Structure 1
Amino acid sequence: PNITNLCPFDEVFNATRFASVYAWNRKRISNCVADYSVLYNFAPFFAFKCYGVSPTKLNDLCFTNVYADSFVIRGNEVSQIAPGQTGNIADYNYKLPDDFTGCVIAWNSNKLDSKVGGNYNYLYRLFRKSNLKPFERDISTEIYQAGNKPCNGVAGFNCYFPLRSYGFRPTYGVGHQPYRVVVLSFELLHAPATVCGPKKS
């Protein structure tokens, strides 16, 4: 069988613009042949931690749907993109379930996401009433009511705007430089699995 119809991993990893972690981008991947060769080849990756499947045997075990979630966080927060973790990103921006089957990929993005004046186009949620459920997004801009008095839509004392900017600058320390994260989540359903890697003969 000849090899064609590769899965669009160039669109997710090599996008010119990623998304904020509060409005994290989700792309479904189905009915194509996914080769993980290109990802392994790429050297800059800071984390390639995989959960539930081995990175070496990605090409043979095959799945029904592959979800690629792309966002940008700061380097110190990459450890929070894991099952069972807590923090601002885990509780309020992006939560993975405790039975997560997939991989997390992160790499430094100073040359693309850092500006000398400060890149104010990457945002994160700092305040939220309750923790996020797994694979949930919150794009609400409602004023966080931390006290007893009603906020009435106006910030001030005990009333904070929940979305705070990741003011990325190139002179930050390595733990604070912008990191692009792609989370690959693999799922199997009762449907026939149609995301399967390449074949050899």
Structure 2
Amino acid sequence: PLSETKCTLKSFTVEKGIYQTSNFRVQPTESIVRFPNVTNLCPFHEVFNATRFASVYAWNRTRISNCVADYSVLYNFAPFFAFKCYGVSPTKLNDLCFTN
């Protein structure tokens, strides 16, 4: 601290007394995130666990809203699916928010 006092006074000599130099702060240790929890609701596996998968000539459109998009229900089933996307990345999609 003597060198800090010399730098604050900009001199090599210093008389007797008390001098303020800087401040002290306690730094954080770890991070904590507190978000919504297990109480959720999203039916999304209904368009995967069926038999009549909307025959090509009579394809059916199903809007899915008011849900929490969790792309982990396909791994619980057979992993024989292929996650081929166009224009969107499967990694930056997990942290997005869509309407319909």
Q: TM-score, normalised by structure 2?
A: 0.54
Is it true that 1:32 corresponds to 2:36 in the alignment? no
| CA RMSD after TM alignment | 1.5
Query: Percent identity at matched positions?
Result: 84
Q: Pairwise mapping of residues 82-101 of structure 1 onto structure 2 (< 5 A)?
A: none
Is it true that 1:14 corresponds to 2:49 in the alignment? yes
- Aligned partner letter, 2:80: P
Give the distance between the partners of 2:92 and 2:73, measured in 1 at CA.
14
Deviation at 1:25, TM superposition (A): 1.4
What stretches of structure 2 of length at least 5 have no aligned partner?
1-35
- Name the counterpart of 1:5: 41
Q: Pairwise mapping of residues 167-186 of structure 1 onto structure 2 (< 5 A)?
A: none
What stretches of structure 1 of length at least 5 have no aligned partner?
66-201
Q: Kindly provide the CA deviation profile for residues 22-54 of structure 1, in whole angstroms up to 9, marking residues without a partner as x.
A: 110111000111101122x24111x32112221
Instruction: Indicate conservation of the 8 Å contact 1:36/1:58, yes or no.
Output: no
Q: Pairwise mapping of residues 114-153 of structure 1 onto structure 2 (< 5 A)?
A: none
Q: Pairwise mapping of residues 36-51 of structure 1 onto structure 2 (< 5 A)?
A: 36-39=71-74, 41=75, 42-45=78-81, 47-51=82-86
- Aligned partner letter, 1:5: L
Give the distance between the partners of 1:64 and 1:52, measured in 2 at CA.
18
Give the distance between the partners of 2:83 and 2:66, measured in 1 at CA.
25
Q: Kindly provide the CA deviation profile for residues 139-163 of structure 1, in whole angstroms up to 9, marking residues without a partner as x.
A: xxxxxxxxxxxxxxxxxxxxxxxxx
- Structure number with the higher strand fraction is 1
- Name the counterpart of 1:95: none
Give the distance between the partners of 1:13 and 1:57, measured in 2 at CA.
23
- Name the counterpart of 1:61: 96
Q: TM-score, normalised by structure 1?
A: 0.29
Whose RCO is larger (CA < 8 A, sep 6+)? 1
The alignment covers a number of residue pairs equal to: 62
Give the distance between the partners of 1:56 and 1:5, measured in 2 at CA.
23
The runs of 4+ residues in structure 1 deviating greater than 4 Å are: none
- Structure number with the higher helix fraction is 2
Give the distance between the partners of 1:26 and 1:15, measured in 2 at CA.
15
Pair member with larger Rg: 2
Give the distance between the partners of 2:94 and 2:67, measured in 1 at CA.
13
2:63 partner SS = strand
